[PDB]
Amino acid sequence: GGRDLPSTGFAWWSGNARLINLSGKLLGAHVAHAGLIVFWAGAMTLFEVAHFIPEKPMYEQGLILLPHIATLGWGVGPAGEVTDIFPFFVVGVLHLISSAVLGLGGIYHALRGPEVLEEYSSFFGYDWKDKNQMTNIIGYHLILLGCGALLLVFKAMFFGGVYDTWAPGGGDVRVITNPTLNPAIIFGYLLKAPFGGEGWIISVNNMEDIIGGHIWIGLICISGGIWHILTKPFGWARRALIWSGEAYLSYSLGALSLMGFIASVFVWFNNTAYPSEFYGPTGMEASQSQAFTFLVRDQRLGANIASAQGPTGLGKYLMRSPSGEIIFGGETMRFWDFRGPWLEPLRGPNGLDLDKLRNDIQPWQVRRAAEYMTHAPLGSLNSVGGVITDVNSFNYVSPRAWLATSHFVLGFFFLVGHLWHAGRARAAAAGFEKGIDRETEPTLFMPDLD
Amino acid sequence: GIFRFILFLQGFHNWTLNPFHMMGVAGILGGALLCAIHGATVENTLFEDGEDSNTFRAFEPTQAEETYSMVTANRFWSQIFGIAFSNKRWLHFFMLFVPVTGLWMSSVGIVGLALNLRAYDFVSQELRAAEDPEFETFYTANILLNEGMRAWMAPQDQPHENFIFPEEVLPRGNAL
């Protein structure tokens, strides 16, 4: 393989393009990189464990990995209190050590192994233009992805459960026993609108629906894996797509961009798969928490919170949603679709119930609302909490804010990468990625426009 | 400090409302547009004058021929956008002309602001809002924003004036 411009036509700043047709070095690149991902997982987990104060809420402490492990049900109890520090440490150590194994294997294949795998084995050696082998690799990796989704199902059903924030008695690690196998609910989540009140798949509000979706995903991915091992692409697919390594890269780039946007919105809105005991309140959660906190405070002073008009004529504490539901007032009218385990006990069939607001508010709901309104996902880049006009004394930016911003930006730049690699794949397959040929310039043969 | 000067000219001069500034914004954003669109158009209508996928080494500074197709670029932008450059000399003079004219026009507006000759108000909308308290536009909202920024910023920004503004005189909306 050429490791310079004169022998490849690619500069140093585009060097990894020198690997496109070197499958062994490409595999080593791919495997060393996986090393890196598992390395960050393990080392970041060990960092977060070392900096963790377990009696303090995770979201106060700049943690984005321990909430993921805690949502799986490890090292936590009721209300997300940390029982034991050892499962988080175990997850870190196992990733870190394995990452050493993956890094050694990538270096081998990259530096010492055969540069092309096609002269060594037909099973592992691939040509990008060989549609059967490409779909075989899709198929192997789909069976593995389905096995991973079924492993999440097995953790929730058979090996200790997941954290359910919606659990009666308070949020707790519970074992899922009746997952939603009903395909109407599971795929009607896919059919729901990506707008307010509907939320597409971001609105999944119970662990039974989540675990049932992963049974179906596991089944769908395993079936699609066998499909693609046993079959070859059909004529419409062969005539519709570009068949090259850069093309398949760009297809994956568009896919990754879509999932990055979905992940940013998921962590910004959903409090079920991202429980607020670990990630802190959502922005909608915190705004409704402030409205509830001052409803409770002024009700304790003797305000008639239902008959109180504000300055505009709308109700100061309670008002009507556009479909009529009894909701909190002020600007949080926007957030009347919010649902949370601290709030839903005060909701009736028509919305917020006057009787429950008068004589069913518990002290823990007040405590949770005060904590969530003061841990709103508002913060500066140097991690100064609250509104931006506040002074420097509160060191806090929400993990929801960090995760959402990161993945939105990642998703955008991966769309840019999709456009770049798709466009280049199209031009390279069509033969003009290196520029216009002067003799056969296509515009010089076209008629004039006017 | 430059950011302070910027916000100062907003709240005290309504410098966003000044057409001389708006022409400057048009010139600067247009010059950035022209930079981006011209660089991308040249880099994507390049002639294949070399064998590498690295297209940068297919150019020589002593060569007499154009390194990119003006004809293909003109056809591309004529079909995409409706019009296109057909004259390279006019293209580059326009690339000069737009941000320089923007800078000169914004300078004229700043000379106006030197004497407090502002485009602060639309007097017709002020008289209508003064006589009719249902009439609200975005212009009147921006006037209220400037009022608040002036009153809250002036004692610390002009400490030599010894502005003592008690808390009760500061304009503020409900609950903030």
């Binding site: 426009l449 006017d450 | 409706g82």
Partner: peptide, 30 residues
């Protein structure tokens, strides 16, 4: 009646856009 003047200047700009596209000086190689 200031609305009439605003509509007129915006209409003049849009009409200039139409005539500048549909009846442009056609680019010719000579």
């Amino acid at each position: 009646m200031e609305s009439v003047a605003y509509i007129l200047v915006l209409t003049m700009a849009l009409a200039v856009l139409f005539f500048a596209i549909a009846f442009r000086e056609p680019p010719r190689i000579e």
